[model samples]
Target: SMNPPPPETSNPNKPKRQTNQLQYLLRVVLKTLWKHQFAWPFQQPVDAVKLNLPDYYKIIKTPMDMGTIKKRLENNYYWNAQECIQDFNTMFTNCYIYNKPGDDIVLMAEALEKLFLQKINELPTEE
Candidate 1:
């Protein structure tokens, strides 16, 4: 028997509606990092050839930077707040890993990283 079928599904047990609040919090963190002088080195990806750190690519399999992170946030590419922070952590951790602890870049990255952890706490809890 030929019959018309009712439209259905794409239906979930429940629906989720969201706001850009977390992204806004991310922007705040971005702004804070930018205002800090220590943020310069992390503002863009390392130019290994220019900087003469030829082994940079070998050590940093995934190079992240504030510029890329900002674009990701603007693109809504982050799955969650944690995902966003992970990039920032990677950005800082890469500096720590590639350079000595007492080196200027590591020192600055350490400072910026400290503040980053504190700022991310501003995100509102979702239940």
Candidate 2:
């Protein structure tokens, strides 16, 4: 199963830097998810100002369910990359940005999705 449930840590005294089983599983799932949901589907030659701009525009225009995505991201008990926290923090910032009806939700959700890509990409590879 992708993004498998996090297993309980047997030793709570483990070094903070040393990864646990949950982190390892997250790296595995994120790798596969990135390949399919992002890299494999979106490929464009970088032309400076226009590279993937079209695709980026398309994603922004398309509607998405932030609740579901956020739930999955949060529910999965794993935190290996700091990028994940960075993105979530950025998303929270956008959530507090200028309110225009329900626009904050849309803006925050989009930012979260995009930053999620960065988090997944930065995941440490398992040897």
Candidate 3:
């Protein structure tokens, strides 16, 4: 007579062993990225027309954003840490491509990239 499922979790298809330590750790890093001041630019899907970036859609085929990344992480879409790293870098790389060097947004993207690598290195890699 209490909380039906286990603490700090959910989902029926997933078994009790669903939560991975790596997943938890990645979430921690992502959480920090979300709170970063320069993260606003990558926080959501780019509006090519609204932002007057007509070439953005043509240049970036696989667009990535912070919201999408967060959802993917939360939903267990990543197979491992490498997959998470791929998507995170994709978001930053996209910024570098669409924005000019020395631009505020691009600089923010660079800053976030620095933070990403440092945080990622803190985690232990394994099989």
* Candidate closest to the true structure, highest TM-score: 1
Ranking by lDDT: 1, 3, 2
Summarize candidate 1's per-residue lDDT along 23-86 as a digit string, tens digits.
6645688988988988888777787776877788778777788877776666566557676778
TM-score for each candidate, following the candidate numbering:
0.79, 0.25, 0.77
Task: Quantify all predictions' global Cα lDDT against the true fold.
Answer: 0.72, 0.38, 0.71
C-alpha RMSD in Å of predicted model 1 compared with the true structure:
13.0
Query: How much RMSD separates candidate 2 from the native structure?
Result: 14.7
Q: How displaced is residue 99 in candidate 1, in Å?
A: 0.6
- What candidate 2 gets wrong by more than 4 Å, as runs, is 1-102
Please, what are the lDDT tens digits per residue for candidate 3 over residues 1-127? 1112212223456532223544754467888888998888777777776677777777776788877777666767555766667878888888888778999888899999998888877675456
Model 3 misplaced regions, further than 4 Å? 1-22, 124-127
RMSD of 3: 9.6
Q: Model 2: how far is 45 from its true place, Å? A: 39
Give me the displacement of residue 94 in model 3, in angstroms: 1.1
lDDT of 2: 0.38
